[PDB]
């Protein structure tokens, strides 16, 4: 090796020894270092074995022949030079390793081999170099090399084709080149360019990325962690995601090395402008190194993104499973908002970290490399500069710690907000009926303001950290130079170091974010590890032995939580098989607690409970999913028409199906809001009955149905002559009409078994229950999320800009422009201006500091803008959602509304401001580069348009697909939330019916759809990026080829920078365009039709408007949607002032539709209501709802303080609230509570019994107490003693106000002056109850089934 023949001569020729040693050691060596490592992948990852094909054999045979040929050389050498022995033998054995490797790759099922192809490429290049040398030299050993080269070339061509396999994702069958360049998606790219992409065009998820192949692994690792240990979530994380992620370390290291090597080649090339061969070889080397850098970096990015997506899938699945197995105490502790945050944006924090977590070691690697270069270029003086960086470590770290705390608080606040929103979604009908939309809007606004203040402080600290990190290189430069002068600096020596500082700045300009991502991910890990470590109920607590007493209990002390006192005190009873059991009692005595204790939903302090046989449970509050009635009754069961029809007919559900539009196939709504209370209860009971279980725990299944339907159901389903006659049945009921039929009656008083026996046994004991008995007192309703088809409207960008404000936007743009101008001036000053040294070295520092402050400036200007816009975008949304009518919440499932408030809002909060910042930075960088290359060589400006033009085209070609993918991702994420909500609403039902596995599979399917939408998005980013970077690399080599041909310079180092800036301007613009989809989806609800104006100023009623309360319907036809039949066809009532009127009728007749129409919840289809000579159709919405009270059918208590539930407006004094609780017969219960009125109600009020929730509704009705009271079955799930107490207080407090009472208990309506009988939506018997009884009509019959005659 000497420079005369290798570099100095115009003939590019290697030396003979170099040819025979290094050029042969390179490829053989590559396979030797990779071979061992490759067994790891070949072993850990398997896909079967490929069959015997001609291609595989062709490759194997050529591997055998190639080895022979190489050993044939050793034979001829055996037949002086030392290299003529070792080299042929080494090549032969590495060749024997190559053929063995394709053999084992066949065995392990790999169609395209990256190793073989790259290995053959390197061998080919080495052979090409020797080939050219051997053909320039000119039989004996040359012909062996020609044979070797031809065989190697054919082997390389063969290695490109993909072998046979052992809406599929093309990556599973793509060739090696296709996957290294992400070509397997280009088909969807052009498709997505001709028509908007839909979910149908999207490919099915890869097997490795599928939820049921990812979540289980994480669950198993977590279970092992808990078995061996507090359990550290981080441990299971890398024990679950490192085996695949660690290859990104190799890709990152290779990319770092080659991205450092590239600029060296650039500098040598620009120094070159020596014969033309040197320039051609240098440009080819730069080109191939750049292309390899892009490919390797981009595989690294794909690995990080796929690992992050798998992390999100695993986190969502684990959260779902834990929520399924969670205990009630932990479920109360970890609110629904917290679970929604964990599964919605907590894995987003992990997703981002994935990309930066491969930099935590890369940034200090380049930092220490530049530091060593500084040491060798300037001596030990640089250690002083190190000190500065050292003193920059704690402060930032300290701030990071502070930021962490903020994030924690921020996250906590977010949970609260989401939890509150969930309550608003669940009790929206009650919220609007009570005119409480404004109060809860203000509550959510206060929570959001607190959360945004915390986020603003966190953004301030992040801006300070970014500022100090951006000013650190310049301060280090100045400190090092000042220490160095006190031997002398050389103008060249001084400035060969300034560039090193510009290189070191890159890392110090990402640690600002790597730190933020790590802090957010650490907070997320903490929240998720705390959730996954929550106490879980065990099925082994209840000895659920398969099918001599069906249910036996021995001294059970069940408690809802360990901290709280036990609810069940010494429970002991034994129910024989097939025995009808009624659990009677007053409000809040643990009857539903007893049933949930038999379901293992209650923590057991001590006892022995054995429940034998399958359990079928019906919750007092019926849980209904979005599936139709047939799928609700089936509940994932095989359809048997003979039994399904019998169950439907027996449960008195047939007439409701007759009056339903599509019968039993019509969609039923997210929460059963389509159905009535009685129909909901009947559907839940029929679902339990159809599932043939051995034990049926029925909790008030006939409380919300009339006497006739209740008797029909009991005789045909529950009673001794019903379908359930052979099953043990625990019937928790308050009605005592069916007690004589009961085989065993258990009285639950104070939480314990006060009395046990039959009706004839308890009527002779002469006890408390004896006194109680003596006293006798398809359609497709829901609309799924829709993805917009087209460019996002510029109105969305305007909405995000006008929310930020003119001043903030102008200041941010000015600071961006000033920062990039200062940076350009500094860099340009260094480039051209190169004693003046200290003075110029000071200018570099001065401009540099002037840059950092501006970097700080917009960092504190965009972020606060992100606080402003998120403060507006949410508020309008919070307004837009509430102002929307009840029909909107009916048709929109509670996964779109949660999506806007959880994930799209999070994207608006944090992602969009940062992405806007990086878009403005890239755009101004491109403008500055355009100015730079315009001032220099103005003749080149002719190529300024077309260059940008082509880039523009690529940008367009990409967004037309990319947006849709993002849109589809959001549209694919809305259902998942819904499922969680549903799963969170009916956890007890799912656990009791043992349908946990089916719901787990449904959640896995929904997450699989979401990732089917999300994975093509990241693959699209990679594909676009490869092409964009390749465009640049083919303008670097091209400008380089052109410049070398026209040598006798900086057009290249200008062209490369402009192409890189344009590539990262296109990528950023695509990112901003995709992120604006979040604002588009938030604004989607703005155009949705809303309710009538809340307050009509002109048509305001008098202050004392309902003073008479003379409600007068004219016809008031009611139609929920303009696709169904009327439910209030031509009713004419003339309710007088202060008239006790009772709207009684059959279940599902339209009684509560009257109440919904009185409040203008549903606009009148035909007719009007003139209350006190004032038409409500004309009155303001609040002017109507604030002057009419209602006690809703479904008692919902929003999570929070009990006093907050009684009046969220907080306009009643605590003394008055105490009085209102006293007339509700709840004073004793609230007073024995440890927290008194500040008692925290659970999510949806589950902390209280439904009787106590009805009492709370009555108490808040007493609090309002206007001249119109609507009693929508207030006495529905309360005992007879409480029932009469409620009626007596109403009879007293509501004595001079018009009251419209809908009830199935006719004994509460005989005192009413006159009643409204409803059958199917028409005015039936109409008059005084005594007159109707004389008429002997339908009211008489209803009183007959009620036992009142
Ligand atoms: N939100 C809704 N959308 C569409 N149809 C509905 C809706 N709510 C109820 N219905 C239908 O209207 C009819 C009457 O329902 P409504 O709410 O008036 O019953 P109800 O009189 O309150 O019954 P119950 O006696 O059980 O309280 C039924 O056919 C029911 O399925
Ligand atoms: N999730 C919960 N957290 C805390 N306490 C609860 C919870 N669920 C029920 N309780 C308490 O259990 C007690 C009894 O509730 P349960 O519903 O069993 O009463 P009940 O007498 O059957 O009610 P009802 O008369 O309405 O049928 C009440 O003190 C209630 O507050
Ligand atoms: Mg109950
Ligand atoms: Mg009703």
XYZ file of C-alpha atoms and ligand atoms in Angstrom, residues 591-593 620 699-700 732 734 1249-1251, ligand 3:
12
model
C -79.915 -6.653 49.766
C -78.081 -5.680 46.585
C -74.935 -5.877 48.699
C -81.189 -3.141 39.858
C -82.356 -7.652 41.943
C -85.687 -5.818 41.520
C -84.542 -9.080 45.879
C -89.854 -4.690 47.831
C -78.182 2.236 46.866
C -80.695 3.066 44.151
C -83.245 3.729 46.884
Mg -80.659 -2.439 45.978
